[PDB]
C-alpha cells in the first residue's frame, strides 16, 4: 500500500495517539503536517508502549517497519498488520485482543518474536502460526485459552521460548510439543491442567526450564505415572514461579503433595 500524494498524518492514521506516534517518529512538528510515501518508507522501528493507541489504521503504509513495540495499548483489531512483511518483532502484549483473524500472520514470515500476552484471547485459529517458520519466541501468557488446536505449534521448528502460563488450559493436545526440538523455555503454570498426554515432553530434548506449578494435577494412578516419572528424571528443569529449581512445585490437587512423590504400583 502506497499514498500517491502528500497527505496529513492525521488523515492517514485516524487514531490520535498513533498519529502523534508517527509524528514524533518522523520528527514532524504536528499531526497536521503532510507526509510522503518516502518518509513513511523510512520507518524501521515504532516504539509506543503504553501510548493509549486504540487503532493502528494507517500502519499498512509502512512497508519497511521491522520492529513494532505496541505493548500496553488499547488495540482490539490488528487487521492492518497483515502485509507488514518485514516484521521481525511484533509486541502486542497488554492490549484488548479477544480474537485473531484467521491467517493474520500468514505473510509475516520473517517474524522471530511474537508476544500476545495479557490480552483476552478466547481461542487461537487453526493454523494461525503455520507460516511463522522462523519464529523463536511466542508468548501467550495471561489470556483465556481453554484449549489449543491440534498441531498449533507444529510448524515452529525453531521455537526457543513458548509461554502458555496464566491461561485456562483444560488439556494439552496429544503431540502438541512434538516438533519443538529446539524449545528451551516452556511455561505452563497457572492453568487448569489435571493431566498431560503420555510422552508429551519426550521430544523436547533442548528443554532447560519448565513451569508446571498451580495446576490441579490429578495424582491418581496410573494416569499420573508419566508426569511423575518425567519430573523425577528432569528435576533440575522444573522451576517455581520465583524462578528457582523446584521439582516439588508441581502439586497434586487435594493433598498438595508433590507430583513427583507419587509412585504407581
Amino acid at each position: 500500500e502506497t499514498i500517491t500524494v502528500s497527505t496529513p498524518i492525521k488523515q492517514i492514521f485516524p487514531d490520535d495517539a498513533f498519529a502523534e506516534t508517527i509524528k514524533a517518529n518522523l520528527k514532524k512538528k504536528s499531526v497536521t503536517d503532510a507526509v510522503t510515501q518516502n518518509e513513511l518508507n523510512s520507518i524501521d522501528l515504532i516504539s509506543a508502549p503504553h501510548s493509549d493507541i486504540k487503532s493502528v489504521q494507517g500502519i499498512q503504509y509502512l512497508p519497511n517497519v521491522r520492529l513494532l513495540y505496541l505493548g500496553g495499548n488499547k488495540l482490539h483489531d490488528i487487521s492492518a498488520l497483515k502485509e507488514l512483511t518485514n516484521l521481525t518483532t511484533l509486541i502486542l502484549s497488554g492490549n484488548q485482543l479477544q480474537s485473531l483473524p484467521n491467517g493474520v500472520f500468514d505473510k509475516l514470515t520473517n517474524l522471530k518474536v511474537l508476544w500476545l500476552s495479557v490480552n483476552q484471547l478466547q481461542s487461537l485459529p487453526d493454523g494461525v502460526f503455520d507460516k511463522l517458520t522462523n519464529l523463536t519466541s511466542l508468548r501467550l501468557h495471561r489470556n483465556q485459552l481453554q484449549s489449543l488446536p491440534k498441531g498449533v505449534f507444529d510448524k515452529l521448528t525453531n521455537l526457543t521460548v513458548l509461554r502458555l502460563s496464566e491461561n485456562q488450559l483444560q488439556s494439552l493436545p496429544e503431540g502438541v510439543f512434538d516438533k519443538l526440538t529446539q524449545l528451551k523455555v516452556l511455561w505452563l503454570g497457572r492453568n487448569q491442567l489435571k493431566s498431560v498426554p503420555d510422552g508429551v515432553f519426550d521430544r523436547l530434548t533442548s528443554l532447560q526450564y519448565i513451569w508446571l506449578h498451580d495446576n490441579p494435577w490429578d495424582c491418581t494412578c496410573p494416569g499420573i505415572r508419566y508426569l511423575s516419572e518425567w519430573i523425577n528424571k528432569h528435576s533440575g528443569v522444573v522451576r517455581n514461579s520465583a524462578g528457582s529449581v523446584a521439582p516439588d512445585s508441581a502439586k497434586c490437587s487435594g493433598s498438595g503433595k508433590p507430583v513427583r512423590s507419587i509412585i504407581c504400583p
Partner: protein, 72 residues
C-alpha cells in the same frame, strides 16, 4: 516517581529485554541486567532472572546448571 520502568534512578519507557546491552530482565518495574555470563539473544529474552542459571544460553562455558567464565 516513575510511571513506567526504572533503570537505577532513571525513568525509562522500556528495558533492554530484546535489544540493547547489557540485556535486562524486569522485576517489579525495575530494569536489571542479566547475569554477565548469559549470551545476549537475538529472537528471545536473554535471561528470566538475575542468576547465572537463568540464561537462555551461556556466553562462554557451562557448569550445569550455571553459565561460567572459565572452563570447568
Amino acid at each position: 516517581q516513575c510511571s513506567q520502568f526504572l533503570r537505577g534512578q532513571e525513568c525509562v519507557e522500556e528495558c533492554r529485554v530484546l535489544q540493547g546491552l547489557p540485556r535486562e530482565y524486569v522485576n517489579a518495574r525495575h530494569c536489571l541486567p542479566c547475569h554477565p555470563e548469559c549470551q545476549p539473544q537475538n529472537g528471545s529474552v536473554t535471561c528470566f532472572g538475575p542468576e547465572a542459571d537463568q540464561c537462555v544460553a551461556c556466553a562462554h562455558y557451562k557448569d550445569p546448571p550455571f553459565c561460567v567464565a572459565r572452563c570447568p
